[PDB]
Design a protein around this motif. Structure first.
Motif, mmCIF file in Angstrom:
data_model
loop_
_atom_site.group_PDB
_atom_site.id
_atom_site.type_symbol
_atom_site.label_atom_id
_atom_site.label_comp_id
_atom_site.label_asym_id
_atom_site.label_seq_id
_atom_site.Cartn_x
_atom_site.Cartn_y
_atom_site.Cartn_z
ATOM 1 N N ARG A 198 0.901 -1.122 0.078
ATOM 2 C CA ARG A 198 0.046 -0.011 0.171
ATOM 3 C C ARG A 198 0.801 1.347 0.022
ATOM 4 N NH1 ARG A 198 -5.449 1.120 3.470
ATOM 5 N NH2 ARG A 198 -5.952 3.450 2.565
ATOM 6 N N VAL A 199 0.604 1.917 -1.074
ATOM 7 C CA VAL A 199 1.455 3.376 -1.086
ATOM 8 C C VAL A 199 0.597 4.652 -0.861
ATOM 9 C CG1 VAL A 199 2.672 4.887 -2.646
ATOM 10 C CG2 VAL A 199 2.907 2.373 -2.860
ATOM 11 N N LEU A 204 3.340 10.209 -3.695
ATOM 12 C CA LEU A 204 2.449 10.613 -4.835
ATOM 13 C C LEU A 204 2.702 12.099 -5.168
ATOM 14 C CD1 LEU A 204 -0.763 8.632 -4.384
ATOM 15 C CD2 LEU A 204 1.234 8.095 -5.855
ATOM 16 N N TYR A 205 3.212 12.313 -6.411
ATOM 17 C CA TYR A 205 3.593 13.567 -7.188
ATOM 18 C C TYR A 205 2.295 14.460 -6.588
ATOM 19 C CZ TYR A 205 4.995 16.881 -10.593
ATOM 20 O OH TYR A 205 5.402 17.933 -11.342
ATOM 21 N N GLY A 206 2.521 15.677 -6.185
ATOM 22 C CA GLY A 206 1.547 16.593 -6.051
ATOM 23 C C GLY A 206 0.725 16.436 -4.653
ATOM 24 N N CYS A 229 -4.316 12.217 7.450
ATOM 25 C CA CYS A 229 -4.781 10.802 6.704
ATOM 26 C C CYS A 229 -4.209 10.837 5.361
ATOM 27 C CB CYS A 229 -6.364 10.863 6.887
ATOM 28 S SG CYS A 229 -7.077 9.389 5.947
ATOM 29 N N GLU A 231 -5.125 8.897 2.646
ATOM 30 C CA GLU A 231 -6.006 9.057 1.915
ATOM 31 C C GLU A 231 -6.849 10.093 1.589
ATOM 32 O OE1 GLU A 231 -7.085 6.749 -0.411
ATOM 33 O OE2 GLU A 231 -5.595 5.027 0.460
ATOM 34 N N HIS A 232 -6.880 11.018 2.424
ATOM 35 C CA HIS A 232 -7.669 12.533 2.436
ATOM 36 C C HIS A 232 -6.877 13.162 1.652
ATOM 37 C CE1 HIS A 232 -10.378 11.726 6.149
ATOM 38 N NE2 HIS A 232 -10.450 10.904 5.420
ATOM 39 N N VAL A 234 -4.488 12.513 -0.682
ATOM 40 C CA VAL A 234 -4.278 12.019 -2.135
ATOM 41 C C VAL A 234 -5.504 12.392 -2.950
ATOM 42 C CG1 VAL A 234 -4.136 10.026 -3.620
ATOM 43 C CG2 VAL A 234 -2.676 10.090 -1.323
ATOM 44 N N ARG A 235 -6.744 12.033 -2.455
ATOM 45 C CA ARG A 235 -7.885 12.377 -3.130
ATOM 46 C C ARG A 235 -8.003 13.743 -3.665
ATOM 47 N NH1 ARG A 235 -10.741 7.756 -3.344
ATOM 48 N NH2 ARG A 235 -9.554 6.180 -2.209
ATOM 49 N N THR A 236 -7.529 14.851 -2.739
ATOM 50 C CA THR A 236 -7.473 16.258 -3.012
ATOM 51 C C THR A 236 -6.238 16.631 -3.487
ATOM 52 O OG1 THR A 236 -6.944 16.529 -0.618
ATOM 53 C CG2 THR A 236 -9.371 16.521 -1.144
ATOM 54 N N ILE A 237 -5.138 16.100 -3.819
ATOM 55 C CA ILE A 237 -3.893 16.386 -4.198
ATOM 56 C C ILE A 237 -3.717 17.781 -3.656
ATOM 57 C CG2 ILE A 237 -2.497 16.872 -6.334
ATOM 58 C CD1 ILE A 237 -4.615 15.471 -8.140
ATOM 59 N N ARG A 240 -0.196 20.368 -3.915
ATOM 60 C CA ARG A 240 -0.090 21.190 -5.114
ATOM 61 C C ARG A 240 -1.088 22.233 -5.280
ATOM 62 N NH1 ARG A 240 -2.280 20.251 -10.936
ATOM 63 N NH2 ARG A 240 -0.577 21.155 -12.376
ATOM 64 N N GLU A 241 -2.266 21.862 -4.524
ATOM 65 C CA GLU A 241 -3.504 22.538 -4.417
ATOM 66 C C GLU A 241 -3.305 23.720 -3.391
ATOM 67 O OE1 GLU A 241 -6.723 21.563 -6.356
ATOM 68 O OE2 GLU A 241 -6.367 23.613 -6.497
ATOM 69 N N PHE A 268 -14.790 15.302 -2.919
ATOM 70 C CA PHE A 268 -13.939 14.134 -3.003
ATOM 71 C C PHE A 268 -13.867 13.161 -1.722
ATOM 72 C CE2 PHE A 268 -11.939 14.045 -7.265
ATOM 73 C CZ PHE A 268 -12.509 15.215 -7.880
ATOM 74 N N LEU B 85 -16.537 9.097 -7.575
ATOM 75 C CA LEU B 85 -15.228 9.684 -7.515
ATOM 76 C C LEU B 85 -14.124 9.059 -6.854
ATOM 77 C CD1 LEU B 85 -16.092 13.227 -6.352
ATOM 78 C CD2 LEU B 85 -16.003 12.495 -8.737
ATOM 79 N N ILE B 115 -10.788 3.619 5.740
ATOM 80 C CA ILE B 115 -10.816 3.710 4.060
ATOM 81 C C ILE B 115 -9.841 2.644 3.643
ATOM 82 C CG2 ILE B 115 -10.558 5.118 1.823
ATOM 83 C CD1 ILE B 115 -10.879 7.423 3.645
ATOM 84 N N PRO B 117 -7.434 0.381 0.833
ATOM 85 C CA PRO B 117 -6.440 0.910 -0.344
ATOM 86 C C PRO B 117 -6.827 1.123 -1.867
ATOM 87 C CG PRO B 117 -6.084 -1.517 -0.131
ATOM 88 C CD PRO B 117 -7.313 -0.956 0.796
ATOM 89 N N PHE B 119 -4.439 2.278 -4.110
ATOM 90 C CA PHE B 119 -2.940 2.065 -4.540
ATOM 91 C C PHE B 119 -2.100 0.953 -4.064
ATOM 92 C CE2 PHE B 119 0.838 4.407 -6.082
ATOM 93 C CZ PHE B 119 0.831 3.616 -7.081
ATOM 94 N N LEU B 120 -1.953 -0.094 -4.708
ATOM 95 C CA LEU B 120 -1.012 -1.186 -4.212
ATOM 96 C C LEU B 120 -0.101 -1.492 -5.262
ATOM 97 C CD1 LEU B 120 -3.504 -3.967 -3.096
ATOM 98 C CD2 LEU B 120 -2.495 -2.099 -1.526
ATOM 99 N N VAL B 121 1.187 -1.695 -4.981
ATOM 100 C CA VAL B 121 2.282 -1.921 -6.013
ATOM 101 C C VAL B 121 2.912 -3.416 -5.559
ATOM 102 C CG1 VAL B 121 2.730 0.674 -6.083
ATOM 103 C CG2 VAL B 121 4.221 -0.693 -4.376
ATOM 104 N N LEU B 194 -0.531 6.431 -11.362
ATOM 105 C CA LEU B 194 -0.767 7.713 -10.618
ATOM 106 C C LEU B 194 -2.000 8.600 -10.799
ATOM 107 C CD1 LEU B 194 3.034 9.082 -10.960
ATOM 108 C CD2 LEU B 194 1.961 7.437 -9.283
ATOM 109 N N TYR B 195 -2.671 8.771 -9.448
ATOM 110 C CA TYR B 195 -3.880 9.533 -9.373
ATOM 111 C C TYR B 195 -3.522 11.102 -10.157
ATOM 112 C CZ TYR B 195 -7.869 11.625 -6.906
ATOM 113 O OH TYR B 195 -8.962 12.325 -6.498
ATOM 114 N N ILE B 227 0.625 16.272 -14.761
ATOM 115 C CA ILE B 227 -0.396 15.907 -14.135
ATOM 116 C C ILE B 227 -1.599 16.138 -15.232
ATOM 117 C CG2 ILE B 227 -2.117 15.875 -12.216
ATOM 118 C CD1 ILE B 227 0.103 17.232 -10.471
ATOM 119 N N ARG B 230 -5.801 15.239 -15.194
ATOM 120 C CA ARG B 230 -6.732 16.097 -14.247
ATOM 121 C C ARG B 230 -6.680 17.567 -14.931
ATOM 122 N NH1 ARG B 230 -5.841 19.359 -9.437
ATOM 123 N NH2 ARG B 230 -7.324 18.929 -7.908
#
Lengths: 341, 338
Positions: A198-199, A204-206, A229, A231-232, A234-237, A240-241, A268, B85, B115, B117, B119-121, B194-195, B227, B230
């Motif tokens: 799990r990453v 993650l970029y951004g 968190c 996950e929170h 990531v979904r919102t990037i 960068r935002e 999101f 989403l 929540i 996962p 994303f898994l690698v 990547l997201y 990116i 998006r």
């Protein structure tokens, strides 16, 4: 001339353990300033800060990371350079003491690839391959008996038991050198009993961090690092935002609107019962360099530390939500200014 | 009712292999439409399309993916649902014939869902796939005669896939799958995992009047640093879809400060934009605008409307005067779904 702002997690820092959290943030700031005063690159400066933060057995990053579902340590880390805009990151990396060092070296190599060097080198490596690349590049490998602590091992057993029936303590930093170049980095051990592979946001970029120097459509050099968190974020990037929002004149208001509108009220995360995250930000513009620094979070508290090279003493602090505010529903934000030669 | 648009890479499709690429795109579209008509979810439809794309020995995804430095196959794939989403992704995955199916399972489990996962690698993604009933796949099945020869060749020293869909209610979904760069170092993860970079799907909402779905292809690194997926989705919220996408490919990609050190930017995208244009309160119609744009020599695509029942394939090529890595080709159309 130089400034650094670091964080030791966004979540909950008890009064009894506050002291320890702030001490590592103090040490991380000093390591960063030493590099800057020694003429190091901004990236090497934030990497120095992160190495110190990872090394603490009390942080969910590097040594001390939460053990996953299998009782193993897998780390995520990333870094960005505002001048070159280059990036480096690793995910699900085990067997390496300082994940940020690997991410830093991937960034460095990437820079070597620009001076005509075949196709672009990798900016993101995970798992076994990331480990092999690290070792092959002279980065120190670390045994499981050293990455694991008595306490993390004990929490593992408890967590397992609780299933048959702290993790928010990630780290980050942002720096700006005397020329106005910024850099950011973030490191994490991920969710406590996460599935192998799990990453999270730290890789993650951004999402985990962001660094971008002043440009045509970028009046300010900005650097951001996150926590909370995964996950929170990531979904919102988020990183960068926040960087893009900081192009507005009023930094404090721009960051506040972002945390409220783009984070807490984000479509999101609509299904979540409370949004948890925090950020540290640096914004600089040449005139001397005028630097604005801030930290914001929706978590109960967040540990931060900042230091100016010309000043000399690091300031550490545990930012808490005010009375009445509710974790995951409200936003805390504070900041300051500093001018650099 | 429903619409689907797929791509079999942005790079260069020789006139001698053209019919092959177009054929795979035709089947992928038919596969997606069959799902939609059977009443399936948009994500299930895009997954069916991607499975077909992956299964082709002509595509750098799933079976036939480029062999890495060590001659092994590691895949990247992701999928996004516009209605919830939610997202699903896998990176550096080996031993699995259809990476996209694993990403789709991750997304589904996330919907059922602290929540889960998204994303898994590596080994972990592999273990997860096997544990949820997806059988492993031995090396010889995923290695083609071409990739093996290519590997030996390479060692003696852009055919990725995607799809976007909109169901009869206007829900969109997008997916992307890639084998990555030939001879890449083990563990190297690219844009397809990547997201925000590989694909994007987002239904009409408060900040976005249009439901949008984007899938990408081309130079992994270029797509990641910008990116793009998006960025395109956000650009498509402008009134003029065609002009918005063109400006995005020109300024946020080709002329992006994040790619200034590069001599030529290579990538392409397929996009879908939808909104309700009419209704009979006394039945509804969806206006679906679809486009494809690229800076590579060519891009192979295919699209189909459930109501037209006639798959359309096409290889978009830079016309004389346009230089790959320096210019932007863009084409598109519109259709209405009742």
């Amino acid at each position: 001339g130089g400034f650094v702002l670091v964080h030791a997690g966004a979540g909950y820092h008890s009064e009894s353990k506050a002291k320890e959290y702030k001490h590592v943030c103090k040490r991380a700031c000093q390591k960063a300033i030493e590099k800057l005063q020694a003429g190091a690159l901004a990236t090497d400066a934030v990497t120095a800060a992160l190495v110190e933060l990872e090394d603490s057995p009390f942080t969910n990053a590097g040594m001390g990371s939460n053990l996953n579902l299998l009782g193993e340590i897998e780390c995520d880390a990333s870094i960005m350079d505002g001048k070159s805009l280059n990036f480096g990151a690793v995910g699900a990396l085990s067997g390496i003491k300082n994940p940020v060092s690997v991410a830093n070296r991937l960034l460095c190599e990437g820079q070597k690839g620009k001076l005509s060097a075949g196709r672009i080198p990798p900016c993101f490596l995970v798992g076994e391959g990331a480990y092999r690349w690290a070792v092959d590049h002279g980065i120190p490998s670390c045994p499981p008996n050293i990455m694991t602590t008595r306490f993390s091992l004990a929490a593992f057993k408890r967590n397992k038991r609780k299933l048959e029936l702290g993790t928010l303590d990630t780290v980050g930093a942002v720096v700006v050198d005397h020329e106005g170049n910024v850099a950011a980095a973030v490191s994490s051990g991920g969710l406590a009993l996460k599935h192998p592979g799990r990453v999270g946001q730290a890789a993650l970029y951004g999402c985990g961090c962001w660094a971008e120097n002043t440009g045509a459509h970028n009046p300010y050099s900005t650097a951001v690092s996150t926590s909370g968190c995964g996950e929170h974020l990531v979904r919102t990037i988020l990183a960068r935002e926040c960087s893009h929002a900081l192009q507005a004149e009023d930094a404090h208001q721009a960051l506040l609107e972002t945390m409220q509108n783009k984070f807490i009220s984000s479509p999101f995360l609509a299904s979540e019962d409370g949004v948890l995250g925090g950020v540290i930000v640096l914004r600089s513009c040449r005139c001397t360099l005028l630097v604005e620094f801030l930290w914001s979070h929706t978590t109960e508290s967040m540990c931060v530390g900042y230091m100016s090279a010309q000043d000399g003493k690091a300031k550490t602090h545990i930012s808490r939500l005010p009375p009445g505010a509710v974790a995951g529903q409200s936003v805390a934000i504070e900041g300051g200014v500093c001018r650099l030669e």
